[PDB]
Amino acid sequence: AKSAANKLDWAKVISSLRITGSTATQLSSFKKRNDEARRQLLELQSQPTEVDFSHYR
Amino acid sequence: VSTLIPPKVVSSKNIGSAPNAKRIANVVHFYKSLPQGPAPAIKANTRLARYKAKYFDGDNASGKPLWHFALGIIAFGYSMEYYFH
């Protein structure tokens, strides 16, 4: 689902003809970008909630 | 927190300043006009209009009507001078 959203967002960014002179939509763009970066960081750095007592205890 | 909306805000935004000013001028200038040479109104014969559609037409309007008018004037003046002189 994120792939199509990124595709359309980037296509809109690169196809701006009468969509220039903006101040806050780019801010929301970086907000979404850093939100996705935090998503990826959380998935790659998922610590183990339960204690791994099978091998650690 | 909502993002700006250029293509969503076009109701108040027009094409620059001059193009929208001249849009009304150019939209109706081509609306109510003859398609191609309609209503020539060439036909006219009321002595003055007979001259208009016979020799005084603007297609040539050469010196020939002027020479004919001068010939008529001198023809009348010959009789006038015979009456007077």
Swiss-Prot record, chain A:
GO molecular function: proton transmembrane transporter activity
Subcellular localization(s) per the UniProt record: Mitochondrion; Mitochondrion inner membrane
Top-level taxon: Eukaryota
Signal sequence, renumbered to the chain: none
GO cellular component: mitochondrial inner membrane; mitochondrion; proton-transporting ATP synthase complex
Gene Ontology biological process terms, A to Z: proton motive force-driven ATP synthesis
Major location category of this protein: mitochondrion
Keyword terms of this UniProt record: Acetylation, ATP synthesis, CF(0), Hydrogen ion transport, Ion transport, Membrane, Mitochondrion, Mitochondrion inner membrane, Transport
Additional remarks: Present with 6820 molecules/cell in log phase SD medium.
Annotated family: Belongs to the ATPase d subunit family.
Role of this protein: Mitochondrial membrane ATP synthase (F(1)F(0) ATP synthase or Complex V) produces ATP from ADP in the presence of a proton gradient across the membrane which is generated by electron transport complexes of the respiratory chain. F-type ATPases consist of two structural domains, F(1) - containing the extramembraneous catalytic core, and F(0) - containing the membrane proton channel, linked together by a central stalk and a peripheral stalk. During catalysis, ATP synthesis in the catalytic domain of F(1) is coupled via a rotary mechanism of the central stalk subunits to proton translocation.
Record note on quaternary structure: F-type ATPases have 2 components, CF(1) - the catalytic core - and CF(0) - the membrane proton channel. In yeast, the dimeric form of ATP synthase consists of 17 polypeptides: alpha, beta, gamma, delta, epsilon, 4 (B), 5 (OSCP), 6 (A), 8, 9 (C), d, E (Tim11), f, g, h, i/j and k.
Name this polypeptide is given: ATP synthase subunit d, mitochondrial
Residues of the full protein shown: 4 to 60 of 174
From Swiss-Prot, chain B:
Family to which the UniProt record says this protein belongs: Belongs to the ATPase F chain family.
Primary localisation category: mitochondrion
Keyword Cytoplasm (UniProt): no
Keywords annotated in UniProt: ATP synthesis, CF(0), Hydrogen ion transport, Ion transport, Membrane, Mitochondrion, Mitochondrion inner membrane, Transit peptide, Transport
Quaternary state and interactors: F-type ATPases have 2 components, CF(1) - the catalytic core - and CF(0) - the membrane proton channel. In yeast, the dimeric form of ATP synthase consists of 17 polypeptides: alpha, beta, gamma, delta, epsilon, 4 (B), 5 (OSCP), 6 (A), 8, 9 (C), d, E (Tim11), f, g, h, i/j and k.
Further remarks about this protein from its record: Present with 14600 molecules/cell in log phase SD medium.
Signal peptide start and end residues: none
Name under which the protein is recorded: ATP synthase subunit f, mitochondrial
Described function: Mitochondrial membrane ATP synthase (F(1)F(0) ATP synthase or Complex V) produces ATP from ADP in the presence of a proton gradient across the membrane which is generated by electron transport complexes of the respiratory chain. F-type ATPases consist of two structural domains, F(1) - containing the extramembraneous catalytic core and F(0) - containing the membrane proton channel, linked together by a central stalk and a peripheral stalk. During catalysis, ATP synthesis in the catalytic domain of F(1) is coupled via a rotary mechanism of the central stalk subunits to proton translocation.
Residues of the full protein shown: 7 to 91 of 101
GO cellular component, one term: mitochondrion
Keyword Membrane: yes
Gene Ontology biological process: proton motive force-driven ATP synthesis; proton transmembrane transport
Localization annotation: Mitochondrion; Mitochondrion inner membrane
